[PDB]
């Protein structure tokens, strides 16, 4: 019947999250552009809270991703058409 605190999880925040360098396995590290790691507890200041029994999924939207897939394919096709036109022009010159 001894309920004793064994520690608390460390929470690390960087000023520029866009600048974190991407390691493997959904991990990041701090770099020159990301600033120094700000060490703090949870629920303090600007830090968030820690909830047990939950996981975070991806933050992607399948609708938006599929639409961006369509748009990127269309842009690819248009640029390939431009390249084809240029090759046709060069071949047209080369047949005088």
């Amino acid at each position: 019947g001894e309920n004793v605190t064994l520690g608390r999880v460390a929470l690390v925040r960087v000023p520029n999250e866009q600048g974190l360098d991407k390691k493997g396995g959904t991990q990041w590290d701090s770099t020159q552009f990301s600033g120094d790691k700000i060490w703090g507890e949870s629920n303090k200041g600007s830090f968030g809270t820690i909830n047990n029994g939950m996981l975070e999924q991806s933050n992607i939207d399948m609708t938006q991703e599929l639409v961006d897939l369509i748009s990127a394919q269309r842009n690819f096709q248009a640029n390939s058409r431009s390249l084809e036109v240029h090759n046709q022009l060069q071949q047209n010159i080369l047949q005088i």
Partner: protein, 52 residues
Amino acid sequence: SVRVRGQQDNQVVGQLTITDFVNPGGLEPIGQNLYLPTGASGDPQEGVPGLD
């Protein structure tokens, strides 16, 4: 600059300098994608790549 394992704040290992010419067309092409300054080329003016 290069990044070393177990070390933030990537270490600087050098500083590139580039040279400009008043008349780059007067350079003497010596082959191998290289040019040599000539009398009509002007004096080589050196500096950091992004200033002056």
